[PDB]
RNA sequence: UAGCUAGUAGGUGGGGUAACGGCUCACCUAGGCGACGAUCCCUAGCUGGUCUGAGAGGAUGACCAGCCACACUGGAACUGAGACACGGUCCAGACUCCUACGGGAGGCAGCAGUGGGGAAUAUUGCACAAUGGGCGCAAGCCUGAUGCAGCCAUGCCGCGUGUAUGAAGAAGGCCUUCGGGUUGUAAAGUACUUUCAGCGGGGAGGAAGGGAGUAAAGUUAAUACCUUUGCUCAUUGACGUUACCCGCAGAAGAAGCACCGGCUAACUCCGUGCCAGCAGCCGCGGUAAUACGGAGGGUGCAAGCGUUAAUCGGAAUUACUGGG
């Protein structure tokens, strides 16, 4: 039971993967309100101020001809935030997307 | 600047008042004895110049007066009050 | 603060020290009183390894120059006796 | 640094035989030798006193195997020396290893003795020397190392050491391959051809 | 003669000026390089010697002569100045540096190619 | 406001990942952190081009010395910065299972593997082949050096890769996507002020890296010395105008330690 | 640039400085500098020294070292023996940054590194192993000074890129009076060798000190403590996969640049044709170019070679040596 492992069990990683005008920033700019701390051309880290765990964020340009960030950062992150909106569905990125998750 | 030897920017604050003091309480007993040279009194002049002694030589032996100034002084008061009197 | 020091002079990788008399607020190739005798670290055994006048230094003594390690090293290396 | 080319070119180009392709052969007369040193050399030149001087200088030099600068150095060491210039350039050529391997016979030609002193085989006084301008001092024995000795090409090349002048001002074993060098040679001594005072003349101005 | 002159007035020494103005002794210059056109030579030689008005870096007007056959010069392309007079044109006294900035080497050649940038042939 | 309880509840201890050896868990040491991006850099007055990492086994030292692999060097770094709340804080160590931000100069590309002395690498590397758009054709032509110098600080990563021809112009912007505006724009920062705009040049088929064993691609640089070009970070791919000229390539034999590069 | 100066010049007295001192105030006189350049403008850190020159001289003073001055600009004070202060304080100004907008933070002409300038100049590296500096009795701590490591042929120096033999005087190129010559012992072939790179092993020196223990002599009442000297043990290296030595393999991985009319070293052919062009000066090219371009050959220098920029000599063409 030493504390070493005990907070390697506090850190985990969610990127955030989605289509294009799904939200990512606007989710995670939301999320920095919760630890009390053309479109998407940048990659940003967010470790956290957050209470129980540490949980890191990591964002990436969605689109195909953009998201080559993703390819090589979704294998950083084990799991996987997946954002989708109604109006646009399923769609040919949310297809990538998958065929690159069901990998690992 | 940050520097953890700020220590003696403040500490040299708490000089300038103190020993500067002594300094100033110094000169005033100086210039009182000027006073007894606008006075004409010797026998104030004098008990000036017996009140200003030690207090300037003690100033002289605390590394504030180096020995020399208050030896002019001393020097140049008694021809003063030798001359007046 | 006057010392009798090494200066550390000579090539790269080829040191050859200068046993001086120098002041202490002074650089270590800086300015000097007068230089007496040398020291080479990497002198293998010839025909000179160490010049030393004891007279200049016993001088130095006799007005106050602190002696370093190195210094004192090399005096108990030109001994009296030996 | 070294030249590496046509060697013999080079004789005929001076019309005097360089020693360049000395070798176990005697004389050649396979290059048709002081009547083409090139594709125009049946034409007389004018030959002026700058052009002897730069032949002098180019002669002595591919005898003695050394570059401008290097030889230019030899000239600036020469010039504070006491005596005479020439005599003192002359003397610090033949000073060079090299030319005192290649004066023992260990090697047909120069070159051959630059690469025995190069490839660690040439040690004087029990220090192995690679460079070929080391300076010989005076009273200084130069053999050849056991883990090189005698692999044939000292061999053959020493019977070329039985046809030269043998010189006085060195004297070898030929038993172990153990030289003994001595004084420094008179300018009465050293080939009886070269003119020191044409390399003066180039070196003056 | 008549030293006390000399003691009066010291001897000057002339101060040669320098064939380029180049500000405070450099080797070379980079310019703006316009105006690119042929120019008629001085007595002696009746060519058409191509030349270009360089707006210098530092406010300098020069003239620098196009060496070389060939080029790519459209009221564009910076360049290297070199000094070095040409004894061909009155007023030119720069050369432009070829296998420097935008100016390209000459085409298809061997023999001194340490001028005029071209490299060695490598087939 | 919900999801924090599920992030929380859900996930589980980040996963091993492998090595050609085996899986390296997250208890044990040789700190894992390899490169992912090496992102297009906003510039304060430096660029330090990023470094994300995977640093998930052992916990940070201040003092610590990397280990780089591939070039096996013993490279000291005490400095690195965490990403609290975007802005890039203090040198400051954490618990592992973060990922940080050094400063590297041109050292450093995509998958650089780091132990303490585990020389081995990773299965990473998804990366594609570009298709290649237009040009560099430098527009207001005064001081090249800013595309000279800034341009090859983006031929590093994922998205850029920029190729030089012999001739000195016409510099190919590299782009794997279509949308080359992402370097358009950052052409306006403290170092990058030339605009260069776009046009219509064919180029076709995305450079195929390739760079062979001694002894023999020497004559395969002389046979062809006008169809060579310098790419980012010193190779020569060969030249890609046409599926034809790549046939040749393929009937010349170039026999290869192939490294993709890509 | 021919007049400059009014705390200006001197003296007396008071004050002030570690100290003489118009350093500073009260009074008196009209002095003081200057054609052997006073006041004004421009430029410039000074020197030992560097380069060149037989010498006298000329430019320079970048690196090594001494002094002075400066720390975004200006002004001012405190601490102390020493600052009117790079990493100390305050105020005034300018430029950035944060703010909850009440107010604060900053000064790389330090080592690194970035923007801009420019033709032009480096790595956000290791360690106190050695010296030196600071503090401490000492052990120990800091040291971007330093000892180094990385880059740049920037300068100097050295080595190698093979050597010996080898005529059918081979093939190809160039010239020709088409006889032949040149490239050319050059290349091919044969026999040896491997400097330096690649790899695998030993391996100094920069290392003196310091720590523990023991013995002896001082000290003292003291065989206890402390100083010093022998003596026993464990040792202290960033460079460092060190210099250097041995072994493996195979000539195997390693040669370019300028010039060829004279000055000044070296000759022809072909293509244009006062055009393309070269050029440091005289200078060539007008259909037979030793000058342009290409080829062959040669010359010179060599990991450097040419060009450009600056200084001196030649230039006794700034003549004091040494002119009219």
Known sequence: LSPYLQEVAKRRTFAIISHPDAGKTTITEKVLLFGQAGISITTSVMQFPYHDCLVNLLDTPGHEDFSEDTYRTLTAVDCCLMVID???????????????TRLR | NIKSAKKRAIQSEKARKHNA??????????????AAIEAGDKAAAQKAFNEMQPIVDRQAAKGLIHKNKAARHKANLTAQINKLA | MVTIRLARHGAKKRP????????????????????????????????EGTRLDLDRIAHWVGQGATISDRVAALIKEVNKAA | ?????????????????????????????????????????????RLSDYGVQLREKQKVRRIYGVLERQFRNYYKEAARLKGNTGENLLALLEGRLDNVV??????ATRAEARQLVSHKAIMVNGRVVNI??????????VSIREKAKKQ?????????????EKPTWLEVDAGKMEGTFKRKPERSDLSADINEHLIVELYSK | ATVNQLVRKPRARKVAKSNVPALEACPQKRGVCTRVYTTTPKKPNSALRKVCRVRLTNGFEVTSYIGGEGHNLQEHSVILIRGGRVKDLPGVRYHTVRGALDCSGVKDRKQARSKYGVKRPKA | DHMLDGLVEWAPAPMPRQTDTRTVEASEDKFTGFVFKIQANMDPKHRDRVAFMRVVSGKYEKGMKLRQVRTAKDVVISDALTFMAGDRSHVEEAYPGDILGLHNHGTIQIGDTFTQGEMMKFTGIPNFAPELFRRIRLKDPLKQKQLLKGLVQLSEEGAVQVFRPISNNDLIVGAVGVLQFDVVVARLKSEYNVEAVYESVNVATARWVECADAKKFEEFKRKNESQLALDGGDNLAYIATSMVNLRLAQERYPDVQFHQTR
């Open chain 2, 21 to 34: 003091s002594r300094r100033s309480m110094m000169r005033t007993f100086i210039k009182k004895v000027y």
């Open chain 4, 152 to 164: 044939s090409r000292v061999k053959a090349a020493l019977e070329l050491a039985e046809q030269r």
């Open chain 3, 16 to 47: 050859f020290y200068q046993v001086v008399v120098a002041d202490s607020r002074n650089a270590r190739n800086g300015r000097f009183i007068e230089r007496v005798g040398f020291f080479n670290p990497i002198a293998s055994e010839k025909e």
């Open chain 4, 132 to 141: 070929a301008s080391y300076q010989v001092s005076p009273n200084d024995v």
């Open chain 4, 1 to 45: 640094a070294r030249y590496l080319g046509p060697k013999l070119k080079l004789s005929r180009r001076e019309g005097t035989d360089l020693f360049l392709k000395s070798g176990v052969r005697a004389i050649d007369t396979k290059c048709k030798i002081e009547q083409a040193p090139g594709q125009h050399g049946a034409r007389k030149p």
């Open chain 4, 102 to 107: 290649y004066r023992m016979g260990f090697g």
């Open chain 1, 86 to 100: 109604a109006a646009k569905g399923v769609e040919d990125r949310t297809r990538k997307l998958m065929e690159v």
